[PDB]
Symmetry: none
């Protein structure tokens, strides 16, 4: 199914995922598309930072839901 | 100077700060105003998560700049 | 009538309500004022969590009553 | 170490615990001392609900800390 991930800088991308995918799995797909390693990503749904080991289902993220993405860098 | 801190869920608060305030200082101010514990706060500007030991001036955060606020639970 | 909804981190929200308002109506007022999604809200009176579908009058909540608010975020 | 568990009706109990105790272990001690079943207990520290599987040291809960206890039961 499709979900959207919107950066805080206004860029939207479309990902193909399954309810069973972990947040770690979703970050790997984002790297596949955008080149950002998972450790430098923080994903956000309903105002909360999500945990690598929980699933989209855990968070009730469904078809065409929008997550937000921010970078987590050191020094910048 | 005044800055705006916005959650992704529609709440805006205004804070009085100085350019030399650290992000740690700013989270303490948000705790004072809104009650949110500092370890559960993640502040965002320029599409990225901010670090506790840097100042507002370090990130070029100026008067009337908007920061975003998201929550992080986990061990916090 | 007015009621007060206190968090466990020392903040107080004042709400205008009616005795016939449901717990869900109260959560929608809190979403309007504070941005908190109703799905994350748990309202408390007399030390216990309150249920969707009941009215304020069903719990003997009256003018100037104080409720508590705690958050429960799906999946942490 | 000693900790306090306080309900929102002001009922306070003290418990003897170790930093390595899980939140579930704490709920079990509460059941032993006060006869509240663990399923009915929501334990809160720093405004956030605590996960059953995590330890007191995971949350940096130190000697003489106060946890709040909210009761969850349908029908009242």
């Amino acid at each position: 199914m499709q979900i959207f991930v919107k950066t805080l800088t206004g860029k939207t991308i479309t990902l193909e995922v399954e309810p069973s995918d972990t947040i770690e799995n979703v970050k790997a797909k984002i790297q596949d598309k955008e080149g950002i390693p998972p450790d430098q990503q923080r994903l956000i749904f309903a105002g909360k930072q999500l945990e690598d080991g929980r699933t989209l289902s855990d968070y009730n993220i469904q078809k065409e839901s929008t997550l937000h993405l921010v970078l987590r860098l050191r020094g910048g």
